[PDB]
Paper text:
Resistance nodulation and cell division (RND) efflux pumps are secondary active antiporters that are ubiquitous across all domains of life. As part of tripartite multidrug efflux systems in Gram-negative bacteria, they span the entire cell envelope and export a broad variety of structurally and chemically unrelated toxic substrates. During drug efflux, AcrB undergoes a functional rotation where each of the three protomers sequentially cycles through the conformational states loose (L), tight (T) and open (O). Substrates can enter the PD through several channels and bind to the access pocket (AP) in the L state and the deep binding pocket (DBP) in the T state.
To elucidate the conformation of AcrB without the crystallisation bias, we assessed the structure of the variants by cryo-EM. In contrast, V612F and V612W mainly showed particles in the T state (72.7 % and 83.9 %, respectively), with these variants displaying trimers predominantly in the TTO (54.9 % V612F, 44.1 % V612W) and TTT (31.8 % V612F, 53.8 % V612W) states. For V612F in SP-ND we found that all three states, L, T and O, were present, indicating that DDM binding is responsible for the absence of the L state in the detergent-solubilised samples. The T state remains, however, the most abundant state for V612F (53.1% T state in V612F in SP-ND vs 21.3% in the wildtype). Thus, the introduced substitution clearly shifts the equilibrium between the L and T states in favour of the T state. Moreover, the proximity of the bulky aromatic side chains in the hydrophobic cluster might introduce a steric hindrance for the rearrangements associated with the closing of the DBP required for the O and L state formations. Indeed, our structural models of the best resolved O monomer densities show that the DBP remains partially open in V612F/W structure. We assume that the O state conformation is still feasible due to compensating interactions, such as the PC1 and PC2 subdomain proximity, and PN1 subdomain interaction with the neighbouring protomer. Thus, the stabilisation of the T state DBP in its open form and impaired DBP closing are likely the reason behind the observed increased abundance of the T state on the expense of the L state in the V612F variant.
Author numbering: 1 to 1033
Amino acid sequence: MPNFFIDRPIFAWVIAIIIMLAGGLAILKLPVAQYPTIAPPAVTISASYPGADAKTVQDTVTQVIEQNMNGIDNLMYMSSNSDSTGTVQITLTFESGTDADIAQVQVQNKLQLAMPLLPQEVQQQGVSVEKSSSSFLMVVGVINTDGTMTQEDISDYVAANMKDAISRTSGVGDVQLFGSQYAMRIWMNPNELNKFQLTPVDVITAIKAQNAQVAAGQLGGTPPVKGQQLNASIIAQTRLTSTEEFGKILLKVNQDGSRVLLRDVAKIELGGENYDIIAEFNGQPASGLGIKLATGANALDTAAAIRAELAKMEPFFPSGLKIVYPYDTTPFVKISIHEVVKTLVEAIILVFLVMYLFLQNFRATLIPTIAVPVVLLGTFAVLAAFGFSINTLTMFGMVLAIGLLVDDAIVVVENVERVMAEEGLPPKEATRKSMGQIQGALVGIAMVLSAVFVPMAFFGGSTGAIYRQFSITIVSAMALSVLVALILTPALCATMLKPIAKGDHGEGKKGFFGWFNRMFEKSTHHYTDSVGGILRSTGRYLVLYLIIVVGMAYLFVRLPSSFLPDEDQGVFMTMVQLPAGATQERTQKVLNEVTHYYLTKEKNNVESVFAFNGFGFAGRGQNTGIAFVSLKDWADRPGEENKVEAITMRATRAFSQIKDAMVFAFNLPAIVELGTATGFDFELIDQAGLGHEKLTQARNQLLAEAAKHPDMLTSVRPNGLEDTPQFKIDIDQEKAQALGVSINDINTTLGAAWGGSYVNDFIDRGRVKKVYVMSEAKYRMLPDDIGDWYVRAADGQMVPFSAFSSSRWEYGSPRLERYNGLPSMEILGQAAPGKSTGEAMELMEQLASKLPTGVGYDWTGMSYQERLSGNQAPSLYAISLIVVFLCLAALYESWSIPFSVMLVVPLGVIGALLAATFRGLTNDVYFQVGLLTTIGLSAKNAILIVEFAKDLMDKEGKGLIEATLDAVRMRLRPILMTSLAFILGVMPLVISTGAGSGAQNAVGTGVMGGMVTATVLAIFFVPVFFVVVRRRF
C-alpha cells in the first residue's frame, strides 16, 4: 500500500486536506463543558401535610410511600426525611447511564398504588414527582440602590414580572424564588372582636360571600325563540381588586343601625406570603433567583441565554433597581478550558524543538510535524460522529498523545536517513526500501497501544464515565497516526529529501551541533562495550530485578487513596447553626458578625456576601442560616495563602470564638451534583429496632470518640437538628358540649388565629393572588396569650378559651431521616490537612466497630463512589495485561516473546510510584490512567529491540549475542529521541500552577515518573530478558 502513493504524491495531500477541514467544521459545532454527564440521575418526591408533627407525618405519609417503591429497575439507594413543618422529601438515585425519562415514568407508575391510602388532606394539597439536582447553576440577585422599597417589594416585582419569563427559555429546569408574591393579609385584633361579639369564623364566612365570582346565562340563549334579535352575556358579582374595597365588607349591623366593617376590627395590609425567609446582600435588603439547569443541557449555552434575557427587560425596571451576580460557576469553566489550550500549544512547541536538536535540517524536521495537525483535527471529527463533547478530560487525551504519536513518522524518517548515510541510495529508491523493514514495527506499536485502552471503556459506574473519555481520544488518535504516517510521510519524504553525501555525520556543523554529535557517538560506542559484559553472567542482574519487584510492592500499599481532587473555584459557602429554640432575631445577630468579618479582615480577597436567614441545609428552621461568598479574580490573588483552601482554614479557626453557635466554612465538592460539601459522607443506620433515644446515644458516643483524633479528622458535625421542647394544648370536648360551643368553631378559631388560613383569591393588576387571615403579632407570642381569645356559644355568650382547656410541655425531635427504609442519622466532616479522604474513611470504620450491637453503617453520596472505585481497581489491571499478552502473541508467532516483554512492565510502574511519593499525591482516578498509560509506553520501548533482534536472527543467521548487540547499537538513537520528546511534552502539566492546576498535576506527575525508569532501566534489562528466555527454549 505505501508503494502505491510514492508514485502518486498529489493524491496523498488530498486525503490530508479533507481530514483537516472535516475536523475544523466539527470544532465550530461541538458543545463545550467542564465534565461529561458523570452524575447519576435522581428523582425526587415532594408532599405536604400542614399542622402535623414530625413523628405523625413519618408514620402516615413517608412510610406508606416508600413501602411500595421496591422493585424498580437500576435502583442504587433511597433516602427520605420529614420535619415538623409537614413537608416530605423522598429522593431516589439510579445507576449511572439509566434513562432519566424512563425512570421518572416508572416511579410515577408505582406511586399511584399507594395514593388512595394517604390522608385526604395530602391528596387535596397535591404531590409531584420530577427530576432534580442538588446544586444551583447560578444565582441572580436583585437589590434596590436607594433603599426606597422594602424586601417584599423586591420579591414581588421579580416574582410577577421576571420569574415566569426566565423559565420560558431553554435549558432551565427549575427556578427557586427567594421571597414570595404579594398576598392580601388581614391582621385581626382579638380585643376588638370580643367587643362586637364576633369570632374569626364570622370573618371567614363574610369574605367567602363578598369576594366571589359567579356565572350567568346568555340573554339571547339557545335554543332561541323565533325572531330574537339580540345576544349578550349577563355579568354578575366579581372579585375585588384593592385594599380600599376590602374595607367596605360588612360584618354585622347593630340593633341601633350602627355598622361595623372589616376596616374597624382588623388592619388590612398588602404583604408577603411567607415571612420565614430573610435575604440580605452586603448588609442590604434583596431578593433573588435560584436557577438550576435541566438534565442533559449544556451549561455554557444556558448561561449565555440567561444573561442575554436579563438585558432585554432591564431598561423597563422601576428607578432604583439593578442586577447583581453573587454566585456563578461559568467563569471557572471558561478559564479552565482556556488554560489547557494554552498548555497544549506550549507542548507542541517543545516537541518541535527536541526534533531539531538531533542535527536535523529545517526541511527534515517538518516531515513529522504535519502529522500533528492532521491527527488532532481528525480526532475532533470522530468525537462529533459519536456525539461526545469537548471537555477537560478530552483535552488531556490529546495532550498525552502529542508526545506519543510522533514516533510513527520518526522511525520512518530516521531509518531512511540512516540508509542514505550508510548506502548513499537515491531518495526515491531509499524510501522504497525503508518501509519494508519497519512496516511490521509501525502496526505493532499502534495495535499494542490501542490494546491497553480498549477494555477500560466497558466498566460501569461514574468511574466508567471518566474512563470512556480517555479511551475514545487515545484510540482514535493512534489509529489515525499509523494511517497518516503510512499514507503521507513516505510520499512527501520521497522527493523532499535532497541528496546527501555518503558517510556524512556533520563533524563540522555549527554551534552545539559540532559538539553534540561527537559526545553522543562516543557515548554510543561506550554503551555497547558496557552491554557486552552484562551478557557474560545473568545471575547478578536477575537478583537486582527481584529487589525492584519487592520494592514496588512496598510502595504500592503505602499510598493513600482518594477520589477526584478539589479546585479553587472562586466561591465557597458558610453554614451557621444555633441551639434549639433560637428565635429569628438571634440568628440574624450572628449572621451580622459573620458578614462583618469578611468585609473587614478579608477585604483583599472577598467581593460580596449573600446571606440567608431561616433557609439552609439539614432542614428549614428559625435557628439555621447560610451565606454565599464570592471571591475576586484569580489574577488578583497571588500566592497560595490567598486561595480557597487557605482562606476557609483561617475562617473556621476564627469563628470558633462565637458563643452559643456552630459556624463552619468549606469548599464545594469535586462535582456539585452529588453532595453539598467536600469530604466524606457517613451514614449511621439502625437495623435492629433499637429506638430513637438509643440511636442518639450511639451517635453522640461515636462523634465524641472522633473528637479524640484531631490530627486526622476535622470539622466532624451532625447533619440534623437536635431535640426541642414542644407546647401542646389539651382540649376537653366534654365540657365544650355542656357550655354549647361547636367543636368546629374551636378548631377553626385556634387554627386561623395562630397558624393562619387560606380563604380566597383576588385580582391585582390582572394577576391572581391569595388572601390570608392571621392574628396580629403582639397577641400570639406567649402561652398566656390564649386567655385573650374568645369563642361564641350557641346561647350567644362569650366563653374564655381557658374555661375548657389546659396546657403542658413535652419533648420531641423536629426532624427524622430514613435510609433504605430504615431509621438513620447522617455524619459529615473533612480530612485533616496533609491527609487523604481514604485515610479518613479507613479510620472511621475502625471507630464504628466499637459501636453497640444492632447498629450498622453505610456510605452514601461522594463516599459511595470512592468505595466503588477502589473495589474494581484490581480487575482493571488483570484484564489489560491479558489482552496485551494475547495481542503480542498474534504479531510474533511465539509464546516466548510476550514473556520477555511482560517482565519489563514492573520497571515502569515503580517510576510512577516513586514520583507520586515525592510529590505527596494520592492514588486516585487520575492515577489509574497513569498506570494504564505506563503499561503501554513501557512495552513500546521493549518492542523496538525484540522485533529488530528477531529479524536479524532468523533472516541472517546471526548469533544470539551478536543479534542482541546489533539491535541495541542501531536502535539507541530512536529510543532517546522519542522518550525525550514525550518527557518534554508533559513538562507543562507538572509545572502548571494556575487556576484548576490540581487536576493537571495529578495526571502529569504519574506518567512522568514512568517514562524515566522505562528508559534508563529498560535499556539495560531488555537485552538480559531476551537472552534468558531464548536460552530456556
